[PDB]
mmCIF file of C-alpha atoms in Angstrom:
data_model
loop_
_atom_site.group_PDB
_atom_site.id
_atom_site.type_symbol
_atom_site.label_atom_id
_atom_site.label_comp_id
_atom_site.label_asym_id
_atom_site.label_seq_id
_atom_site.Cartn_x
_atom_site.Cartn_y
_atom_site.Cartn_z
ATOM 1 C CA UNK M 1 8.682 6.180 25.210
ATOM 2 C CA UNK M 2 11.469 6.322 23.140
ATOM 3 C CA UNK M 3 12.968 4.416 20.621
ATOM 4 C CA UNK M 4 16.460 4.145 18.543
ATOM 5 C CA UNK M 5 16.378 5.518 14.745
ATOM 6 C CA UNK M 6 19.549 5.949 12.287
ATOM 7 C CA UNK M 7 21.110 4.512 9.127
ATOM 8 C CA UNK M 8 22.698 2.243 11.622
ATOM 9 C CA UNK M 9 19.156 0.447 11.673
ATOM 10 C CA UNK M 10 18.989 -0.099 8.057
ATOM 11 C CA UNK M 11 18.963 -3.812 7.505
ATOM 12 C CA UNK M 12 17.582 -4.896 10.797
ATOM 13 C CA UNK M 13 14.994 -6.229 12.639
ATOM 14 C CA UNK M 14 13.585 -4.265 15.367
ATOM 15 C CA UNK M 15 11.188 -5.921 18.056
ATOM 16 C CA UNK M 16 8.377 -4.396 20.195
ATOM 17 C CA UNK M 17 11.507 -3.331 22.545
ATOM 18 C CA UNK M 18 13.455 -1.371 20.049
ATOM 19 C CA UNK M 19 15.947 -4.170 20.208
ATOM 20 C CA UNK M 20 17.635 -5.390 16.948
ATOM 21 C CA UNK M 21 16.868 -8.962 17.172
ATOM 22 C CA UNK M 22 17.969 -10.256 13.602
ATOM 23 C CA UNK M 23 19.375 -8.668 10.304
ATOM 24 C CA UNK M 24 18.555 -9.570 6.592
ATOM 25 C CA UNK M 25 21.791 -7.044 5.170
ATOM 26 C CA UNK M 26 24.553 -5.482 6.823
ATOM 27 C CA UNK M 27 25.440 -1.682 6.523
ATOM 28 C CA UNK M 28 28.559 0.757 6.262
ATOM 29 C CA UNK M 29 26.934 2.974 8.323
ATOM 30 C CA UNK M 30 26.818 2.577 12.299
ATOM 31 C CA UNK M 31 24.231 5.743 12.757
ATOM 32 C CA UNK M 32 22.206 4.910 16.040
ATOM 33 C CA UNK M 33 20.382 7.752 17.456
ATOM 34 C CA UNK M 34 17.723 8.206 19.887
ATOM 35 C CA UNK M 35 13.841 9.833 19.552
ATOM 36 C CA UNK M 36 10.532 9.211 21.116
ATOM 37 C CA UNK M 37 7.882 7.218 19.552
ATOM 38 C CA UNK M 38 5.400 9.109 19.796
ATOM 39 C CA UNK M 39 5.806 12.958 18.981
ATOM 40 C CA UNK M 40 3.107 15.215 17.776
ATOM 41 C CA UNK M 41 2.364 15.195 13.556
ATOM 42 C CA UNK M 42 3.415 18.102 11.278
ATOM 43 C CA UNK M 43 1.228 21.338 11.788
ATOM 44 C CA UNK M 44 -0.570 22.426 8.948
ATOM 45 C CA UNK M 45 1.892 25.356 7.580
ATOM 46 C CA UNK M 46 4.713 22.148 7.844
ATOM 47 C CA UNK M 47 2.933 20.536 5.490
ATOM 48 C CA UNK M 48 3.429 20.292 1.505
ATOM 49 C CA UNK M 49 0.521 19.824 -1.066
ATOM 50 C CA UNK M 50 0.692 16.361 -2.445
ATOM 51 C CA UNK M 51 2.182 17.044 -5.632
ATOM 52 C CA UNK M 52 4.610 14.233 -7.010
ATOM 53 C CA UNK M 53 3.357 10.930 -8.002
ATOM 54 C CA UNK M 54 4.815 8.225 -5.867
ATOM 55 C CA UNK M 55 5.585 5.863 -9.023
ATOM 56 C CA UNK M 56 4.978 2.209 -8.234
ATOM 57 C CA UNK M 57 5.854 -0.148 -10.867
ATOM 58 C CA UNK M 58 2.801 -1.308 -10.935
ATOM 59 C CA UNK M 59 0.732 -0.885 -13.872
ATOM 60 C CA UNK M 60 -2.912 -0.857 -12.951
ATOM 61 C CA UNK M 61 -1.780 1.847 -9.948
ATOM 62 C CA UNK M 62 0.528 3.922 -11.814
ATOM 63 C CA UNK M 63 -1.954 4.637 -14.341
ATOM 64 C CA UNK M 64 -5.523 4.542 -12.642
ATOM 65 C CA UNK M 65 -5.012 4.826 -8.644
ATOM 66 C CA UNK M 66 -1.327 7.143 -8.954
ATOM 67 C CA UNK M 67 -0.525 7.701 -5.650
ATOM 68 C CA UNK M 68 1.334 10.876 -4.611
ATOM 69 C CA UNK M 69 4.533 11.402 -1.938
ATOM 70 C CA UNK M 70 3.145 11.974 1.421
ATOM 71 C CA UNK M 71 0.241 9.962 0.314
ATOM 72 C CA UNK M 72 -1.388 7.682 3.070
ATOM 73 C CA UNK M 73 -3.137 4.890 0.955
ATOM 74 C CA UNK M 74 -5.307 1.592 2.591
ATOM 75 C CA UNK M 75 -5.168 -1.712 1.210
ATOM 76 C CA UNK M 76 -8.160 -3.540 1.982
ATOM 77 C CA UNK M 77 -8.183 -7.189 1.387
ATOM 78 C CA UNK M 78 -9.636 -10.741 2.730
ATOM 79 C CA UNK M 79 -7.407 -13.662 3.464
ATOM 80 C CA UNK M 80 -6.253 -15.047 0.296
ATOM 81 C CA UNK M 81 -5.729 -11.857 -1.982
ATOM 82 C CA UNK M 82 -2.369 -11.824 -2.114
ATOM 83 C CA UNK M 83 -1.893 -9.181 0.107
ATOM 84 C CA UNK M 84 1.414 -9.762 0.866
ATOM 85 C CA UNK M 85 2.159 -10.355 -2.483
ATOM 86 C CA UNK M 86 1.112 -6.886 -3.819
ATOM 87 C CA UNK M 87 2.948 -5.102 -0.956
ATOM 88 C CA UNK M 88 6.207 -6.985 -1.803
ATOM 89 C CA UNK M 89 5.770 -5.526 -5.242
ATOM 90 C CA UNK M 90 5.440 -2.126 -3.851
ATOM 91 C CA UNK M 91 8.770 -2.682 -2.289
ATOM 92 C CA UNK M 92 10.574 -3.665 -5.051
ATOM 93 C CA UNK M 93 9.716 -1.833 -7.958
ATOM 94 C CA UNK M 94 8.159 1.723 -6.159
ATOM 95 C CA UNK M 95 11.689 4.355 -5.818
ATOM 96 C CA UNK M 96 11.902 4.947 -2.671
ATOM 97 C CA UNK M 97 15.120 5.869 -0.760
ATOM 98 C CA UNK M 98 13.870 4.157 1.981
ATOM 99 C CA UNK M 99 11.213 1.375 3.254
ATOM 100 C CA UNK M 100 9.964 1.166 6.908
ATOM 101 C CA UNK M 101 7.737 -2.218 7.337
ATOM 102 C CA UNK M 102 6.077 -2.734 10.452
ATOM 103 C CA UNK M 103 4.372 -6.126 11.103
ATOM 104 C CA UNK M 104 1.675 -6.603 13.455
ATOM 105 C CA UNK M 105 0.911 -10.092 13.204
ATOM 106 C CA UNK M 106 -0.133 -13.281 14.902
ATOM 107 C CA UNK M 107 2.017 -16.040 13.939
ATOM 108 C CA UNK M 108 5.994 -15.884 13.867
ATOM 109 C CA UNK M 109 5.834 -17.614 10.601
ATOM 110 C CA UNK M 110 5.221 -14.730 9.039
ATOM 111 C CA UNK M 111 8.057 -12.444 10.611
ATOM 112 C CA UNK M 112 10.440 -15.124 9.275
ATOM 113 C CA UNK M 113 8.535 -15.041 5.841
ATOM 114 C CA UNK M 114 8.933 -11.600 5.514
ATOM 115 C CA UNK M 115 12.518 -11.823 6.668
ATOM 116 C CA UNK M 116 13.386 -14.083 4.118
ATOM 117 C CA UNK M 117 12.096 -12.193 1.459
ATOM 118 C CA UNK M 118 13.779 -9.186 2.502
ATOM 119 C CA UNK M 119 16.955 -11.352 2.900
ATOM 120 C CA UNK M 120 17.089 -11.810 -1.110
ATOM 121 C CA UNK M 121 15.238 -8.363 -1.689
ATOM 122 C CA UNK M 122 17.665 -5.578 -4.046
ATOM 123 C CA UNK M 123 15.843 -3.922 -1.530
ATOM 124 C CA UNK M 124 17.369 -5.287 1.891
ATOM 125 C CA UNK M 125 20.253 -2.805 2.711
ATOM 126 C CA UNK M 126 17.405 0.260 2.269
ATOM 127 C CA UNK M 127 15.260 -1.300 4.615
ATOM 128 C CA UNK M 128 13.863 -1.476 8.188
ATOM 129 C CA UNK M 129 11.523 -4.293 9.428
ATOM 130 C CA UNK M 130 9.645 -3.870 12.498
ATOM 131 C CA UNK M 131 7.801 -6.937 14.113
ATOM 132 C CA UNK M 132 5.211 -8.005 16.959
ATOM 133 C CA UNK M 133 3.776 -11.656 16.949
ATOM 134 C CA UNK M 134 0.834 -12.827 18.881
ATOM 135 C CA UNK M 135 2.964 -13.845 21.635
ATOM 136 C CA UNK M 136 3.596 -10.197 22.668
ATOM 137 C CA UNK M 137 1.535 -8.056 24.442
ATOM 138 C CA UNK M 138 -1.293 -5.920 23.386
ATOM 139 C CA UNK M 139 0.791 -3.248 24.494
ATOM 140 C CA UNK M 140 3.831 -4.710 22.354
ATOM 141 C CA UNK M 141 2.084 -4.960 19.438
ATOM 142 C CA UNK M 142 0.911 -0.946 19.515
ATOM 143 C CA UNK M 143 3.990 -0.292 19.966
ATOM 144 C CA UNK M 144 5.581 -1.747 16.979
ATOM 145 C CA UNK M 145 3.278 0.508 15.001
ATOM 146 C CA UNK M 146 4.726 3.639 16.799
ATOM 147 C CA UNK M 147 8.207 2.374 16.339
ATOM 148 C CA UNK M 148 8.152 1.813 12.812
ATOM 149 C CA UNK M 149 6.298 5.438 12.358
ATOM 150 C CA UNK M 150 9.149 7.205 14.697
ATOM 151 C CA UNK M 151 12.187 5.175 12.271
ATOM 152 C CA UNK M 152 10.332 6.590 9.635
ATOM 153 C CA UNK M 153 9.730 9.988 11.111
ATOM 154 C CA UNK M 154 13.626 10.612 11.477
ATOM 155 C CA UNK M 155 14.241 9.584 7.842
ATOM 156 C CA UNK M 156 11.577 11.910 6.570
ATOM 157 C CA UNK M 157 13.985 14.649 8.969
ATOM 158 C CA UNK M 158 17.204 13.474 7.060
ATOM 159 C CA UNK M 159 14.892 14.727 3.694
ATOM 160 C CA UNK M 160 14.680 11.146 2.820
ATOM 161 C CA UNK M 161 11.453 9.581 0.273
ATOM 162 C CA UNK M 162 9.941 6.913 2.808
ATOM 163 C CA UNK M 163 7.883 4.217 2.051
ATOM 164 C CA UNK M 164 6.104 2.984 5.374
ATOM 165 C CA UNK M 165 3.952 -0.355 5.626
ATOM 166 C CA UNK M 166 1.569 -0.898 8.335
ATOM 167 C CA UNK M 167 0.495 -4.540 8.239
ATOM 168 C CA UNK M 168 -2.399 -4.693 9.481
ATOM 169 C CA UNK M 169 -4.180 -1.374 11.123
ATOM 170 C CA UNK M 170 -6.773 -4.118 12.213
ATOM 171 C CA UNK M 171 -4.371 -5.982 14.461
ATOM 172 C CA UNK M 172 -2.796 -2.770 15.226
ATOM 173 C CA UNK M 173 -6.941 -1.905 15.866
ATOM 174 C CA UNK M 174 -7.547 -4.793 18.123
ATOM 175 C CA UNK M 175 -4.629 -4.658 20.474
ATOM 176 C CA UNK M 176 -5.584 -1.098 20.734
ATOM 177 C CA UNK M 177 -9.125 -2.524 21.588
ATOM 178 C CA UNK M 178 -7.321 -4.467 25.017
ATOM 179 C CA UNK M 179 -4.432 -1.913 25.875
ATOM 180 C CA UNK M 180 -8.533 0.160 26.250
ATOM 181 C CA UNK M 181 -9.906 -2.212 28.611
ATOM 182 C CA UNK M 182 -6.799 -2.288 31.054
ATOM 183 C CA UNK M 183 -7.686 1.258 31.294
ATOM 184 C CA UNK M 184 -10.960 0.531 31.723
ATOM 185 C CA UNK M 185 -11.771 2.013 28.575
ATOM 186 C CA UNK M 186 -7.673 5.520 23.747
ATOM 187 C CA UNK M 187 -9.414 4.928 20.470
ATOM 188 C CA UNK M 188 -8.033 8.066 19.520
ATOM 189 C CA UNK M 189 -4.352 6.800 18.619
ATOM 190 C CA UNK M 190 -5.631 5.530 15.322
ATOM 191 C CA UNK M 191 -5.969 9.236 13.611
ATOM 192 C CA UNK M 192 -2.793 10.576 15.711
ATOM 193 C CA UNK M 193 -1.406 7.407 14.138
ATOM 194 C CA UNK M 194 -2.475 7.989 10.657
ATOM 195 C CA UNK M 195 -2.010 11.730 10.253
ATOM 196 C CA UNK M 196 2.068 11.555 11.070
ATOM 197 C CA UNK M 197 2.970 10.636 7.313
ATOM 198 C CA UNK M 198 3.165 13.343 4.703
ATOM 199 C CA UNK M 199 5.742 15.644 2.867
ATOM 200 C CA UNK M 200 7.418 18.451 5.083
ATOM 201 C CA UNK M 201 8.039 21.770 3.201
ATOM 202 C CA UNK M 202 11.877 21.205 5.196
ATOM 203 C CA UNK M 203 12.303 17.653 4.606
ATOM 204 C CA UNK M 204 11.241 14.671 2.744
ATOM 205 C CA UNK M 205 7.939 12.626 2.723
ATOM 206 C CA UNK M 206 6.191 9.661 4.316
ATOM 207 C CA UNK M 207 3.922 7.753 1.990
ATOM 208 C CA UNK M 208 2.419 5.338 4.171
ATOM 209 C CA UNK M 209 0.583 1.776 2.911
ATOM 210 C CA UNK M 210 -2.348 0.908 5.605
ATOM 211 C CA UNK M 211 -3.608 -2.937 5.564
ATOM 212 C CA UNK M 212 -6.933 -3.737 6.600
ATOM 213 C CA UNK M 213 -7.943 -7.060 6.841
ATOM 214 C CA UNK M 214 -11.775 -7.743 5.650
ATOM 215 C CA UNK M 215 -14.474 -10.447 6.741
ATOM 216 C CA UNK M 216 -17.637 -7.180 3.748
ATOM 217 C CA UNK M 217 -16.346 -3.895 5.849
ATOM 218 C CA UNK M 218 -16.394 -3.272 9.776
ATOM 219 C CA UNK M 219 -16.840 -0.024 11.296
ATOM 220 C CA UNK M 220 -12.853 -0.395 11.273
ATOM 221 C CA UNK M 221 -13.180 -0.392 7.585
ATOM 222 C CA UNK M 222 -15.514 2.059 7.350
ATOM 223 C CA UNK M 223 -13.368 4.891 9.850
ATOM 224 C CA UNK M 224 -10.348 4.219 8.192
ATOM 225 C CA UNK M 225 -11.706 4.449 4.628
ATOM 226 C CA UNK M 226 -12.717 8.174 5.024
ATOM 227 C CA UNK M 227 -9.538 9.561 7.056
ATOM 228 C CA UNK M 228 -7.213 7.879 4.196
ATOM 229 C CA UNK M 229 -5.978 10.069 0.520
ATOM 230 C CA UNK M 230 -7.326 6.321 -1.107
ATOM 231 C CA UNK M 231 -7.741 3.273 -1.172
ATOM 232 C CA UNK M 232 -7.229 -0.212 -3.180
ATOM 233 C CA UNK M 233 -9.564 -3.227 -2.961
ATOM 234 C CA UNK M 234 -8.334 -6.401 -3.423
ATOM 235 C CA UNK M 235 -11.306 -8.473 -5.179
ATOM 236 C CA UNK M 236 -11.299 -11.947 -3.700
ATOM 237 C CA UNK M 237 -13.577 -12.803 -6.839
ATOM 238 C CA UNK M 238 -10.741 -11.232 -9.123
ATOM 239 C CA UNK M 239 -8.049 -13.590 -7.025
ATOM 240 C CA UNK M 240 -10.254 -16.429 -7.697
ATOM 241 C CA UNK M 241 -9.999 -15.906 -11.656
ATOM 242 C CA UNK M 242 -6.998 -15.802 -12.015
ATOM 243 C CA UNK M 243 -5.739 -12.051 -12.190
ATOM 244 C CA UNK M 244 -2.662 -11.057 -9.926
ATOM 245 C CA UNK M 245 -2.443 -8.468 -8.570
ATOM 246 C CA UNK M 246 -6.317 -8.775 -7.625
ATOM 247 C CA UNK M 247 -7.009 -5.223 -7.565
ATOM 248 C CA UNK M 248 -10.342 -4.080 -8.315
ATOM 249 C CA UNK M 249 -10.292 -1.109 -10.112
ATOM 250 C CA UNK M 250 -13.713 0.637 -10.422
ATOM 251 C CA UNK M 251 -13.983 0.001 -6.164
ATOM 252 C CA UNK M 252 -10.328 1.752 -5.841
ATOM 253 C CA UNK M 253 -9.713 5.680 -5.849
ATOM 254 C CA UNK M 254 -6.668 7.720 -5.585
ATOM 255 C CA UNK M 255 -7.914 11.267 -3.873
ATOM 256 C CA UNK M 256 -5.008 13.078 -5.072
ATOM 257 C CA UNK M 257 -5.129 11.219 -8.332
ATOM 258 C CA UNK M 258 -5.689 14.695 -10.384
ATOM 259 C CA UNK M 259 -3.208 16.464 -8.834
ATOM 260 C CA UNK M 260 -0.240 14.486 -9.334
ATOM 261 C CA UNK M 261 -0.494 13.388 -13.249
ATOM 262 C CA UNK M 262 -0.719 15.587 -15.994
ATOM 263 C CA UNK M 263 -3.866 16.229 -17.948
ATOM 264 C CA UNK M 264 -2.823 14.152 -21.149
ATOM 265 C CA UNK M 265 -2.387 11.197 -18.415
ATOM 266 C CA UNK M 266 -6.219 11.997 -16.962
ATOM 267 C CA UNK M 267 -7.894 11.676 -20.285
ATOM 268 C CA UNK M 268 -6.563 8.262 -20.920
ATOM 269 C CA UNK M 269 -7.427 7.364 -17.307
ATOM 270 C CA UNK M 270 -10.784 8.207 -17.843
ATOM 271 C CA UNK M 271 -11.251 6.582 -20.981
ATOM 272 C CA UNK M 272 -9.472 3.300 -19.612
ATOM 273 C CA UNK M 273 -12.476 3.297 -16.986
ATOM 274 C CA UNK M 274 -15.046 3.659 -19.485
ATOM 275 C CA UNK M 275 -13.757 0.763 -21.356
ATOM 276 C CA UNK M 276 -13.584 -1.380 -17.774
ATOM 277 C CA UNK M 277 -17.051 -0.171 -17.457
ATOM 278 C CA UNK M 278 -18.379 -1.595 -20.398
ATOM 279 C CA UNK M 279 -16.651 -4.994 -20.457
ATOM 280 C CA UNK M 280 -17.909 -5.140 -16.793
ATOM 281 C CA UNK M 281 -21.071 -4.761 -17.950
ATOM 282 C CA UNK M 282 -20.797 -7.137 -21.098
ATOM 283 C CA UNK M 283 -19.918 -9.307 -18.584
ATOM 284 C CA UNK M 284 -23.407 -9.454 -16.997
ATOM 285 C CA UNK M 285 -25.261 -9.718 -20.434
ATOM 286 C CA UNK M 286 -22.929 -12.871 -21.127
ATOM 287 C CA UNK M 287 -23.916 -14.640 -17.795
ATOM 288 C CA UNK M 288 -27.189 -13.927 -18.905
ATOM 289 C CA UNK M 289 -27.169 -15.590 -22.199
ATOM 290 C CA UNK M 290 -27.823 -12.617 -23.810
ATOM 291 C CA UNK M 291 -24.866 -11.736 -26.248
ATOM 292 C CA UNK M 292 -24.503 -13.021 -29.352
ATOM 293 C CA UNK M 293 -22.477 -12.097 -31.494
ATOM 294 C CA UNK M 294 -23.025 -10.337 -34.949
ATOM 295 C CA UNK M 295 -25.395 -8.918 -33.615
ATOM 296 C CA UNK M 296 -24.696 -5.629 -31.518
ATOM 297 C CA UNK M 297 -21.334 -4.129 -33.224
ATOM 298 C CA UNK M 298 -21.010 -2.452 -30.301
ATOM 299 C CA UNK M 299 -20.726 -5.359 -27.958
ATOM 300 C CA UNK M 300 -18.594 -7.354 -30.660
ATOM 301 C CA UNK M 301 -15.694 -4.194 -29.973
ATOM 302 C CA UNK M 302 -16.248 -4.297 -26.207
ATOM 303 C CA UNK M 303 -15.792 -7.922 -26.205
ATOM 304 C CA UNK M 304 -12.557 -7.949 -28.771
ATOM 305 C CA UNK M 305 -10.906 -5.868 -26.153
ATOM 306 C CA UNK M 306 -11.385 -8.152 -23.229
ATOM 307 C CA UNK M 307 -8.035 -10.410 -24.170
ATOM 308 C CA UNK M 308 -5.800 -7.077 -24.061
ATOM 309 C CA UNK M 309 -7.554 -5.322 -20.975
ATOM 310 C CA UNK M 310 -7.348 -8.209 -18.752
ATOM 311 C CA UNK M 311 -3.791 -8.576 -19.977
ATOM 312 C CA UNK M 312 -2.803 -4.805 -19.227
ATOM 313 C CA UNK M 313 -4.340 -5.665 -15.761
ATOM 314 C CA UNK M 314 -2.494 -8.650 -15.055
ATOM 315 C CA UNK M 315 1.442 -8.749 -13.787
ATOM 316 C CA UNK M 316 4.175 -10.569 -12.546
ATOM 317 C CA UNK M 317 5.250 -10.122 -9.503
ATOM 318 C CA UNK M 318 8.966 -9.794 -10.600
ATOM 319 C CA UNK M 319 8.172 -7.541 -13.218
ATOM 320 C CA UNK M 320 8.156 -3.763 -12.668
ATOM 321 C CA UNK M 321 6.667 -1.191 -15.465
ATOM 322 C CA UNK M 322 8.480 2.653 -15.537
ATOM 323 C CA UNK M 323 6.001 5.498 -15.833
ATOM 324 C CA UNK M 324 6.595 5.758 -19.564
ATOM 325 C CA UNK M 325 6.265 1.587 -20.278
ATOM 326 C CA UNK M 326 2.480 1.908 -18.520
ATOM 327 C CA UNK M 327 1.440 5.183 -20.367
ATOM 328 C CA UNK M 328 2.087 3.486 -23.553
ATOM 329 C CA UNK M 329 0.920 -0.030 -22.810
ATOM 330 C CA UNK M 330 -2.447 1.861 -21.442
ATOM 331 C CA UNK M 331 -2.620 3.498 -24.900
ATOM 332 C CA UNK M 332 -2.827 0.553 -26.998
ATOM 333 C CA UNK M 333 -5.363 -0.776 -24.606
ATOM 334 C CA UNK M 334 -7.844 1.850 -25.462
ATOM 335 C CA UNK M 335 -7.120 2.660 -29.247
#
């Protein structure tokens, strides 16, 4: 019921306890308070329009899915999309002050991946890891979720700009599914869950990442999709091609996406689309055997620009883009 929170956790790994179990950095700051997980979310005059973009790095977000402080945003991806990948990126190259991960997986492979990634992050001493494996309990494992929201929470009090990761709200989902049927059954700790992050008119913001792991969409995809600000796809197709990070564009949305970029920004957003449109499109008349070329000037331009859209799509992971880099790279795309 209640959990520890402070600067003192920055660095550490927290279990389904509130325990610090490991640490990938080492702090100045000794900061170790006490709060309860779970506390009610923000009433509606404590909440702040989403106004400020929450800058990525990431080119193909920054430009056509911007996502805004206090944001909550779903990742929806199969095994094998590099979803780990793309939220590692988010780490490093967003600007947040601060970065709350919470990991509700099976295997403890993957709690020691992560750690070692954070080990040799520039990211490490900002950051807070949160874990449950398979080996803990249902109950464990919903817990982790409400840990890593209540570490967050405080931060957001301090008027700090969080970054929280929830990976995945479907094994956070199915635990919740058992902790249910010990009751007899509870369901409704997913929204009470998911409307916590945001920016408070006194204090700082919560943009939240939500993974949700994809067989095609359950009704767990479904829900989730319409209580989130957005969401980005990750195209198993894309991932097969080639192109990292496999997002698919015309299937993503940012909801706030018009109120946090500037009308100059919106027009080339919308003519970027356009131009995905079309070589999406060209696509299917070249599968068919129908293009040829010389003869539909039209086609001939949309094909030209193929080379350079796919190559504005695609980045390394290592590499980060500032606002102004992507606004100009997206301009020569589309000239």
């Amino acid at each position: 019921l209640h959990t520890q929170v402070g600067r003192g956790l920055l660095g550490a790994v927290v279990n389904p306890l509130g325990e610090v179990t490991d640490k990938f950095a080492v702090t100045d700051n000794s900061e170790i308070l006490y709060r309860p997980v779970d506390n009610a979310p923000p009433l509606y005059s404590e909440r702040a329009a989403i106004e400020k973009p929450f800058l990525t790095g990431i080119k193909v977000i920054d430009s056509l899915l911007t996502c805004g402080e206090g944001q909550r945003m779903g990742i929806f991806a199969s095994a094998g999309c590099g979803k780990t990948f793309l939220m590692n990126m988010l780490i490093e190259h967003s600007g947040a002050d601060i970065y709350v991960i919470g990991l509700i997986g099976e295997r403890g492979r993957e709690v020691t991946e992560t750690v070692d990634y954070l080990k040799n992050s520039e990211k490490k001493s900002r950051c807070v890891l949160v874990y449950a494996t398979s080996d803990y309990s249902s109950v464990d494992r919903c817990n982790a979720a409400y840990i890593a929201t209540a570490i967050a929470e405080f931060f957001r009090t301090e008027g700090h700009k969080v970054a929280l990761f929830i990976d995945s709200l479907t094994r956070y989902a199915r635990a919740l599914r058992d902790v249910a049927l010990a009751a007899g059954e509870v369901f409704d700790s997913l929204p009470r869950l998911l409307e916590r992050p945001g920016k408070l008119k006194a204090g700082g913001s919560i943009t939240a990442f939500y993974t949700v792991l994809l067989e095609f969409a359950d009704p767990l995809a479904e829900e989730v999709r319409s209580i989130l600000d957005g969401h980005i796809y990750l195209s198993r197709n894309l991932a097969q091609k080639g192109q990292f990070p496999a997002i698919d564009s015309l299937k993503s949305i940012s909801r706030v996406f018009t109120q946090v970029v500037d009308e100059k920004h919106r027009i080339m957003a919308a003519a970027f689309r356009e131009l995905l449109s079309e070589i999406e499109e060209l696509r299917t008349i070249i599968d068919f055997g129908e293009y040829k070329p010389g003869e539909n000037a039209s086609q001939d331009k949309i094909y030209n620009k193929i080379s350079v859209v796919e190559s504005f799509l695609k980045q390394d992971y290592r590499l980060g883009f500032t606002y102004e880099q992507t606004m100009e790279l997206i301009g020569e795309t589309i000239r």
